[PDB]
Design an enzyme around this catalytic site. Structure first.
Site, PDB file in Angstrom:
ATOM      1  N   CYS A   1      35.316  33.651  17.136  1.00 54.43           N
ATOM      2  CA  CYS A   1      35.911  34.587  16.196  1.00 54.43           C
ATOM      3  C   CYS A   1      34.866  35.172  15.238  1.00 54.43           C
ATOM      4  O   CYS A   1      35.180  36.049  14.449  1.00 54.43           O
ATOM      5  CB  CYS A   1      37.030  33.896  15.420  1.00 54.43           C
ATOM      6  SG  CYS A   1      36.458  32.562  14.357  1.00 54.43           S
TER       7      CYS A   1
ATOM      8  N   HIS B   1      -1.195   1.463   7.782  1.00 56.09           N
ATOM      9  CA  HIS B   1      -1.772   1.469   6.445  1.00 56.09           C
ATOM     10  C   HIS B   1      -1.600   2.830   5.787  1.00 56.09           C
ATOM     11  O   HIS B   1      -1.817   3.867   6.420  1.00 56.09           O
ATOM     12  CB  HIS B   1      -3.252   1.104   6.498  1.00 56.09           C
ATOM     13  CG  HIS B   1      -3.858   0.864   5.152  1.00 56.09           C
ATOM     14  ND1 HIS B   1      -3.501  -0.201   4.355  1.00 56.09           N
ATOM     15  CD2 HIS B   1      -4.789   1.560   4.459  1.00 56.09           C
ATOM     16  CE1 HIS B   1      -4.191  -0.155   3.230  1.00 56.09           C
ATOM     17  NE2 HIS B   1      -4.979   0.905   3.266  1.00 56.09           N
TER      18      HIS B   1
ATOM     19  N   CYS C   1       0.819  -1.217   0.000  1.00 61.88           N
ATOM     20  CA  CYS C   1       0.000   0.000   0.000  1.00 61.88           C
ATOM     21  C   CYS C   1       0.855   1.271   0.000  1.00 61.88           C
ATOM     22  O   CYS C   1       0.419   2.316  -0.468  1.00 61.88           O
ATOM     23  CB  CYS C   1      -0.930   0.019   1.213  1.00 61.88           C
ATOM     24  SG  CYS C   1      -0.064   0.118   2.794  1.00 61.88           S
TER      25      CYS C   1
ATOM     26  N   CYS D   1      31.028  30.886  14.203  1.00 61.29           N
ATOM     27  CA  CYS D   1      31.762  30.653  15.442  1.00 61.29           C
ATOM     28  C   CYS D   1      31.579  31.796  16.422  1.00 61.29           C
ATOM     29  O   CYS D   1      31.833  32.918  16.087  1.00 61.29           O
ATOM     30  CB  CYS D   1      33.249  30.477  15.129  1.00 61.29           C
ATOM     31  SG  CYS D   1      34.312  30.282  16.569  1.00 61.29           S
TER      32      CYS D   1
ATOM     33  N   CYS E   1      35.928  24.906  14.898  1.00 60.35           N
ATOM     34  CA  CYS E   1      36.281  26.080  14.096  1.00 60.35           C
ATOM     35  C   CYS E   1      37.713  25.993  13.579  1.00 60.35           C
ATOM     36  O   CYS E   1      38.638  25.784  14.355  1.00 60.35           O
ATOM     37  CB  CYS E   1      36.108  27.353  14.923  1.00 60.35           C
ATOM     38  SG  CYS E   1      36.715  28.842  14.141  1.00 60.35           S
TER      39      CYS E   1
END
Ligand SMILES: [Zn+2]
Lengths: 76, 609, 321
Positions: free
Chosen positions: C140, C268, C14, C137, C184
């Site tokens: 920085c 179903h 189905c 980040c 980073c």
């Protein structure tokens, strides 16, 4: 390298991987953080479902990539 | 939480900062400067101006970034905040650690200090702030101390900045919440929540009375606040990007600022129009410390992303203010020298050697196993050197590498530490004249790291690690358990601590000598055309070529020498539709056969010729 | 010239029939499939079979009935060991497999027409979108941007919400912290960071897959999430891009593949589709017209007061044309 997996609740988790790492291994790493068994896990990336026999390099999955973790709803 | 053994490849003494300075602290009484390094080491300098080398000493207890430092008790008593999640108290005159507060759960990013009330607070990514009396910590008496940890609640997000006023009547925190939270340290009562900033607040400053507050945020603005009026009173847009460091004069009228755009500016809070470009540093400004011997301040000390620390003279402000942007200083009056930081590193396919590139662009060859440098290739093209030194071999990952100190730090974990089993001759360990055994790299290295530890009695038999090599034992998530030098494993109290911290997974192999077995691999084998059901039991330790000779014995239906003759004509164990060299290891095929767009079970090709 | 024919259930297929039905009422997909059928390469594969099935549905003398997808299923079972069984399966796994398989076939055909940088097939033209992930980040602040394609979006859910809301939380900034810190390359260490995923290139059809499942670490099993998640009939999306051209395209809901069942291990599948303004329900071989107001409600069940939970699982939004 580090990649990302977006889990069931929408929470993002990090994974430390290598291009030579296989998909089953990745699912094992996901299992370490979320506990979901690999046989129940499905990973979608770039519109494609990842195959356990293949590796990250095969799918060209590089750093900062986000994988989508999904499970299953079975029906007949 | 599992425990990881790690070590640093470095020199006996690292005289200069190897990764830049996060925080600065000046002692006017003894004319001494304190630099907090990203290399995890605090250093002391003499700023007399006339000395060929200002290096005094270096304080190394921390295992990660040192985010902030505080000089208390009217002269010298350094407090430090670190990304190793710990807070350390130091006897600043003699230079050693006294106590370690392991109260914080995440990186400790900032510290605030109340000189008068002799009080000090610490905050980080914990979202929790901790108040501490300096006198109580410095105490050696312990006459019913029953240390009560006093925390400050409220912070929703991760704290990046902290400030306390001289009298210690007000304490404000800055975080990614963009909002600043104020409290009364004496009562722990919440005061206010100053809303105004667009981004994270990385620098906070309070006036003597704590009536007004200065703040610097990644939104590029400096904000003046009145705690009386209970709202912002001013906003100065000075920098074309984030502002991370601020200093003020005693008048609290002139604010000194710097950040990403690398430009350092002094700004008149009263009349913002007056804005003097002090300088443009060679890297984004991370922290500043004024010389307060005179008013107005004669000089400003500047810490950046680089290892070099500089002093810029502010003596000539007054003459430039009346007449006539063009910056005040071009060269610093005094320069504290900096070392190089390793910013790029590459593990070669033999998992023994490492290639690195540093901030000066110098490339160097390293031996992880013997924890030492081997050669300095100089400013060669790094990616090209990497290619040139390519070896067509495969060795499983058995270690990790970090560079957050600007130095090579190798880390061993319980999981893959034991995984690389290579022949000694391959490893360059010739043993004349008996045979070559399959050695485990992580094992040998563990033995060498704890070579001087008596519990393991000797060495590993093959190599020695530099005796000054620091050996750190720590939780993977954060908290550092124990750091000692290799040679110090001898000390009775040291051996006692190794006995208490060293985890079981290491004990099994170093002391008890219960060396681990291998983790076998297997692959399908059949004729590519004809011959006359399942993969045979195999190992990466196997020479792979010898297995092809076993296939010749089935065709037959002193013998060890006759099987070698089959390699000259028969055997022919090709794989991945290509010729396979007999010298290649079985593990190396996984890096070429199954790795080339195929399932991890590729069948081995075979032919009579 | 419309037809409405159901598909035979070949045991636990189905999920197949339902996805095929959802895709059939995606007009550009249907049209491209029919155009593919017309070239007649006459080699058998999943796409040729699909084309045969769609052509049979579209070209039937009557307007209503039932068609058996025997040949299509035979091919599906033949080329994929995973569905070569009589077990219950996921509609999304099937969807994704089918789209990628056809697209791969088409790619191989483009690769073999040149035989006598990468290209894009009509499958991508219809369903493919592109996201831009940005990681900043906090130490920085060096923002790092990365573009990633998608064929569908898998969105996390919450109780009593809308798909528009889920979509907005999806595009909200998330902070990476503590155990999940970002590595980073400037800081050369793990740091807190800000992550945000924005849509860069909008697809012709937006397929939304609801993450209707929850893992219970302590219980070692997962459950189905039967939350109420309202889906609106129309959706408006805006584009980022290079900001030289900026989109604000409208979409309409055309089909929903719905999973019926209290748990995730059994159930179903049925499909609801929009045709000439009214809604139809496909349940294997049965097709019925349903009124528009009833489709909100049962899909995203309220509380518990509903038999064998029937919840929307895959939605198909069609760009206005
Ligand atoms: Zn950074």
């Amino acid at each position: 390298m580090q990649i990302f997996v977006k889990t069931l609740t929408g929470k993002t988790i990090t994974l430390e991987v290598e291009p030579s790492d296989t998909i089953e291994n990745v699912k094992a790493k996901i299992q370490d953080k979320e506990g979901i068994p690999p046989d129940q896990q499905r990973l979608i990336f770039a519109g494609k479902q990842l195959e356990d026999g293949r590796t990250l390099s095969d799918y060209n999955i590089q750093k900062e990539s986000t994988l989508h973790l999904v499970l299953r709803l079975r029906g007949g | 939480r599992k425990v990881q053994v790690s070590y640093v490849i470095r020199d006996e003494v690292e005289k200069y900062n190897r990764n830049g300075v996060n925080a600065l602290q000046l002692d006017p009484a003894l004319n001494r400067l304190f630099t907090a390094g990203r290399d995890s080491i605090i250093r002391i300098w003499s700023v007399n101006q006339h000395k060929q080398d200002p290096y005094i000493a270096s304080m190394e207890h921390h295992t990660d970034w040192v985010n902030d430092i505080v000089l208390c008790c009217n002269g010298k008593t350094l407090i430090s905040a670190s990304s190793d999640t710990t807070v350390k108290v130091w006897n600043a005159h003699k230079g050693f650690c006294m106590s370690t507060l392991r109260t914080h759960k995440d990186y400790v990013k900032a510290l605030a200090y109340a000189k008068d009330k002799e009080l000090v607070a610490s905050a980080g990514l914990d979202r929790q702030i901790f108040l501490w009396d300096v006198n109580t910590l410095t105490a050696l008496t312990a006459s019913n101390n029953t240390v009560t940890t006093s925390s400050l609640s409220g912070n929703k997000d991760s704290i990046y900045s902290l400030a306390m006023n001289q009298l210690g009547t007000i304490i404000v925190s800055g975080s990614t919440e963009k909002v600043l939270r104020v409290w009364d340290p004496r009562t722990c009562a919440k005061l206010m929540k100053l809303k105004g900033h667009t981004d994270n607040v990385k620098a906070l400053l309070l006036n003597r009375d704590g009536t007004q507050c200065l703040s610097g945020s990644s939104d590029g603005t400096i904000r003046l606040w009145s705690l009386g009026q209970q709202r912002c009173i001013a906003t100065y847009r000075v920098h074309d990007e984030g502002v991370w460091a601020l200093q003020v004069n005693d008048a609290f009228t002139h604010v000194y600022s710097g950040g990403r755009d690398r430009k350092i500016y002094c700004t008149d809070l009263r009349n913002p129009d007056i804005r003097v470009l002090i300088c443009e540093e060679k890297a984004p400004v991370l922290k500043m410390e004024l010389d307060r011997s005179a008013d107005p301040p004669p000089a400003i000390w500047v810490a950046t992303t680089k290892s070099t620390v500089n002093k810029w003279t502010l003596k000539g402000i007054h003459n430039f203010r009346a007449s006539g942007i063009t910056p005040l200083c071009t060269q610093p009056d005094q320069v504290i020298k900096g070392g190089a930081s390793i910013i790029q590193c590459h593990i070669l396919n033999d998992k023994r050697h490492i290639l690195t590139k540093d901030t000066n662009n110098n490339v160097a060859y390293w031996d992880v196993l013997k924890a030492c440098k081997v050669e300095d290739l100089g400013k060669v093209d790094f990616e090209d050197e990497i290619k040139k030194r390519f070896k067509m071999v495969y060795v499983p990952n058995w270690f990790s590498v970090d560079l957050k100190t600007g130095m090579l730090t190798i880390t061993l974990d319980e999981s893959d530490c034991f995984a690389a089993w290579v022949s000694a001759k391959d490893a360059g360990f010739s043993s004349p004249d008996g045979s070559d055994p399959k050695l485990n790299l992580g094992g040998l290295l563990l033995q060498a790291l704890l070579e001087y530890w008596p519990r393991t009695h000797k060495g590993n038999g093959y190599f020695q690690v530099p005796p000054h090599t620091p050996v750190i034992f720590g939780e993977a998530g954060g908290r550092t358990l124990f750091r000692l030098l290799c040679r110090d494993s001898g000390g009775e109290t040291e051996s006692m601590l190794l006995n208490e911290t060293v985890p079981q997974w290491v004990i099994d192999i170093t002391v008890d000598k219960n060396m681990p077995k291998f983790x076998x691999x297997x692959x399908x084998x059949x004729x590519x055309x004809x011959x006359x059901x399942x993969x045979x039991x195999x190992x990466x330790x196997x020479x792979x070529x010898x297995x092809x000779x076993x296939x010749x014995x089935x065709x037959x239906x002193x013998x060890x020498x006759x099987x070698x003759x089959x390699x000259x004509x028969x055997x022919x164990x090709x794989x991945x539709x290509x010729x396979x060299x007999x010298x290649x290891x079985x593990x190396x095929x996984x890096x070429x056969x199954x790795x080339x767009x195929x399932x991890x079970x590729x069948x081995x090709x075979x032919x009579x010729x | 010239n419309e037809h409405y024919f159901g598909l035979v259930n070949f045991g636990n297929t189905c999920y197949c029939n339902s996805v095929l039905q959802a895709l059939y009422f995606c007009r550009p997909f249907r049209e491209n499939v029919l155009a593919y059928k017309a070239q007649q390469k006459k080699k058998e594969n999943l796409l040729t079979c699909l084309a045969d099935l769609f052509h049979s549905i579209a070209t039937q003398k009557k307007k209503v009935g039932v068609i058996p997808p025997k040949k299509f299923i035979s091919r599906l079972r033949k080329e994929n060991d995973l569905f070569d069984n009589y077990m219950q399966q996921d509609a999304h796994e099937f969807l994704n497999y089918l789209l990628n398989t056809i697209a791969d076939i088409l790619q191989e055909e483009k690769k073999q027409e040149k035989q006598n940088k990468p290209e894009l097939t009509w499958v991508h033209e219809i369903f493919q979108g592109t996201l831009t992930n940005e990681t900043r980040c906090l130490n920085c602040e060096t923002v790092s941007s990365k573009d990633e394609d998608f064929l569908d979006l898998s969105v996390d859910v919450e109780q009593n919400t809308s798909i528009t809301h889920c979509l907005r939380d999806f595009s909200n900034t998330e902070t990476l912290c503590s155990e999940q810190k970002y590595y980073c390359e400037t800081c050369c260490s793990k740091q807190e960071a800000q992550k945000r995923m924005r849509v860069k290139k909008l697809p012709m059809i937006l397929a939304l897959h609801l993450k209707r499942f929850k893992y219970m670490e302590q219980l070692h099993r997962y459950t189905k999430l039967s939350y109420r998640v309202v889906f609106p009939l129309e959706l408006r999306l805006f584009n980022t891009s290079s900001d030289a051209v900026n989109l604000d395209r409208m979409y309409d809901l055309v089909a929903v593949v719905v999973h019926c069942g209290s748990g995730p291990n059994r159930g179903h599948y049925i499909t609801i589709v929009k045709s000439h303004g009214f809604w139809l329900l496909f349940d294997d071989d049965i097709v019925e017209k349903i009124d528009a107001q009833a489709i909100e409600e049962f899909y995203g069940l309220t509380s518990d007061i509903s038999k064998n939970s029937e919840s929307g699982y895959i939605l198909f939004y069609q760009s206005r044309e």
